[PDB]
């Protein structure tokens, strides 16, 4: 009473996961390889509500305004022009 689905990790490996036929097959499955795998059937349904992580630029932007960055850069390039 089982239906088998196949997933493919990002690196090429493929894995067989036996499921119950009456269940709804997930689009991604944490594989024995240690990576996420994508179903080889239709979907592939969703983007999965992703949000970009916080970066150094973000932390710098919330204190220095864009203008302040331009003048400081103007200070730096002008120092570079003097040789």
């Amino acid at each position: 009473p089982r239906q088998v689905a196949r997933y493919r990790t990002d690196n090429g490996e493929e894995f067989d996961v036996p499921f119950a036929d009456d269940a709804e097959i997930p689009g991604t499955w944490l594989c024995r390889n240690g990576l996420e795998g994508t179903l080889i059937e239709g979907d592939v349904p969703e983007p999965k509500k992703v949000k970009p992580p916080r970066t150094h630029w973000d932390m710098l932007l919330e204190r220095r305004s864009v203008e302040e960055l331009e003048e400081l850069l103007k200070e730096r390039l002008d120092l570079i022009k003097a040789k």
Binding site: W57, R63, L69, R76, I80
Partner: protein, 305 residues
């Protein structure tokens, strides 16, 4: 060097400590390179490649920026070690404490602001200490406890130590729950969370080299006498059901799932024999009073448990 920390201290010592003016210098270069990067990255979307001389210098502003971030860090590695010294012996390896502090040091550099005119060690000390203490709450226990629970366990500890000094004794669960504004039953549940496991490889009694681990029973191990009697019980039921009718026994087996192991509802059994669930309920009561008849039940009595 002979030791591993002695080796790490040798290399952190090869760098030079900055003064206030330098820290400000590097801080500018770091922010300058970052903006130079975000701006060039903005060009990738809409193109508009810069002139040759303007492109070669932007690539240097970024390179000089990361060279700054790396120099500011390498110059303050000594500060992390100075803070980690005090948190040793609390269940984390000295090197792990150092590395976690280094993680905090990195964020201080990312979020540090040079316009405030404060020395760098003033702001970085907050992150390095938080990174070290935050780390301990996530790793120092074999069985992890979330931060908010590790926060209360510690608070309850000091309350007990302060309360210990004022009462010349240890405070009871009622005194502790009062000083901390919580229910006494809660402080007990908390004191159970704080328990730490023990080693199965430990030697109980240096006298007899007996390892605790090998004294632990296997509660889920198969007991021979039971499985054999259970096998005999399974046979005795097969016989008792032989006395019942083909449909009487058939309903009893499906009702309790003797054959499949999956019990069935009254309606489902009525679906195989083509009757209503109530009719099956009736056939059930009668075959049960038949099984309760002493002739069939007397043999199964000894299988109570």
């Amino acid at each position: 060097s002979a030791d591993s920390v002695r080796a790490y201290l040798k290399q952190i010592g090869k760098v030079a400590l900055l003064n206030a003016e330098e820290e400000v210098e590097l801080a500018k270069r770091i922010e300058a390179g970052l903006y130079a990067t975000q701006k060039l990255a903005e060009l990738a979307e809409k193109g508009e490649k810069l002139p040759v001389q303007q492109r070669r210098d932007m690539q240097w502003i970024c390179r000089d920026g990361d060279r700054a971030k790396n120099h500011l860090l390498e110059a303050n590695l000594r500060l992390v070690v100075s803070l980690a010294k005090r948190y040793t012996g609390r269940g984390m390896a000295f090197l792990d404490l150092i590395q976690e502090g280094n993680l905090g040091l990195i964020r201080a550099v990312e979020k540090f602001d040079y316009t405030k005119g404060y020395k760098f060690s003033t702001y970085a000390t907050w992150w390095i200490r938080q990174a070290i203490t935050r780390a301990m709450a996530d790793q120092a226990r074999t069985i992890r406890i979330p931060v908010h629970m590790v926060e209360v366990i510690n608070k309850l500890g000091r309350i007990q130590r302060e309360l210990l000094q004022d009462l010349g004794r240890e405070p009871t669960p009622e005194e502790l729950a009062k000083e901390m504004d919580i229910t006494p039953e809660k402080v007990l549940e908390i004191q159970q969370y704080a328990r730490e496991p023990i080693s199965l490889d430990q030697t109980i009694g240096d006298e007899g080299d007996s390892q605790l681990g090998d004294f632990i029973e296997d509660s889920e191990a198969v007991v021979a006498v039971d499985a054999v009697s259970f096998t005999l019980l399974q046979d005795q039921l097969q016989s008792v059901l032989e006395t019942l009718s083909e449909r009487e026994a058939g309903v009893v087996r499906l009702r309790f799932g003797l054959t499949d192991g999956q019990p069935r509802t009254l309606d489902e059994i009525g679906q195989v024999y083509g009757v209503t669930r109530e009719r099956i309920r009736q056939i059930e009561s009668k075959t049960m009073s038949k099984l309760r008849h002493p002739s069939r039940s007397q043999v199964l009595r000894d299988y109570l448990d």
